[PDB]
Design a protein around this ligand. Structure first.
Ligand SMILES: CNC(=O)[C@H]1Cc2c([nH]c3ccccc23)CN1C(=O)c1occc1CNc1ccc2nccnc2c1
Length: 271
């Protein structure tokens, strides 16, 4: 209606039902839009984000749509806190989901999680869009067990310098290739690297990558050409796929299209 562009949701259309989580970015709530449609309402913590930049980016992000990418529905920008309105993912964080041993996952399910993410990432790569912080903690799981990629690109707007710089205490060192750690070279291939780590996290049922190392030690390990090694649940073929993401030379890492092809081949051969 009047006073709300195509990217703007009227927050008066929201019904708040349950709190989903709280952290440094703000608070996520489960709710309804116009009494009917499930949504997540992501409430941006005041002072945490470069808000005008985020809002301008949100307008572009409205055009991104893929069944394995958490759908952005709009933003609420007229009051503080700012709201991001997205698709609701009832089973929450992938990292926590993986760590719940009750699921007793088959490896076919683990590969399907990898495929879900790979499809979303191929889509983002086709649009020349980087995630910039791909990891199990930034994937979500819906009521049907489908994994979708969440908060893609959000790190560009985070004001906490501990998060954003390669030498910061909250920087995703364990998901970063040597060229990121050494000289902040972000590219498609740093997303590829992170995706390999994410496959590792999935097959490890949510273990911390390099769990016995600090971030500093991890950076040294990977600068010396050393790597994560094969999760017990990963077949040789699955391990080959994740390991291909970790070539020292960024140009020798696959694309998401190639990874997707590889994953599908393994599903045909093994699942
Ligand atoms: C560092 N972390 C955070 O500060 C909070 C708040 C938040 C996040 N991202 C933001 C972006 C903009 C504004 C505030 C935030 C991430 N975060 C979470 O609690 C969170 O992270 C993963 C899962 C959860 C909580 N559970 C769910 C469950 C179902 C969902 N469905 C759809 C969408 N998000 C869901 C979250």
């Amino acid at each position: 209606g009047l006073g709300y562009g195509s990217w703007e949701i009227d927050p008066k259309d929201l019904t708040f039902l349950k709190e989903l989580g709280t952290g440094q970015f703000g608070v996520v709530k489960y709710g309804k839009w116009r009494g009917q449609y499930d949504v997540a309402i992501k409430m941006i913590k005041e002072g945490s984000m470069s808000e005008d930049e985020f809002i301008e980016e949100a307008k572009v992000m409205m055009n991104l749509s893929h069944e394995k990418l958490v759908q952005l529905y709009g933003v609420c920008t007229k009051q503080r806190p700012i709201f991001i309105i997205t698709e609701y993912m009832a089973n929450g964080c992938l990292l926590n989901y993986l760590r719940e041993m009750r699921h007793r996952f088959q490896t076919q399910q683990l590969l399907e999680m990898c495929k879900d993410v790979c499809e979303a990432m191929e889509y983002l790569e086709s649009k020349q869009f980087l995630h910039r912080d791909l990891a199990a903690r930034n994937c979500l799981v819906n009521d049907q067990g489908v994994v979708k990629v969440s908060d893609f690109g959000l790190s560009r707007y985070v004001l906490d310098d501990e998060y954003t710089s390669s030498v910061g205490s909250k920087f995703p060192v364990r998901w970063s290739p040597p060229e990121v750690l050494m000289y902040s070279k972000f590219s498609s291939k740093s997303d590829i690297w992170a995706f390999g780590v994410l496959m590792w996290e999935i097959y490890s049922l949510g273990k911390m990558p390099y769990e016995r190392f600090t971030n500093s030690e991890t950076a040294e390990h990977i600068a010396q050409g050393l790597r994560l090694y094969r999760p017990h649940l990963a077949s040789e073929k699955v391990y080959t796929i994740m390991y291909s993401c970790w070539h020292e030379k960024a140009d020798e890492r696959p694309t998401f299209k190639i990874l997707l092809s590889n994953i599908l081949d393994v599903m045909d051969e093994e699942s």
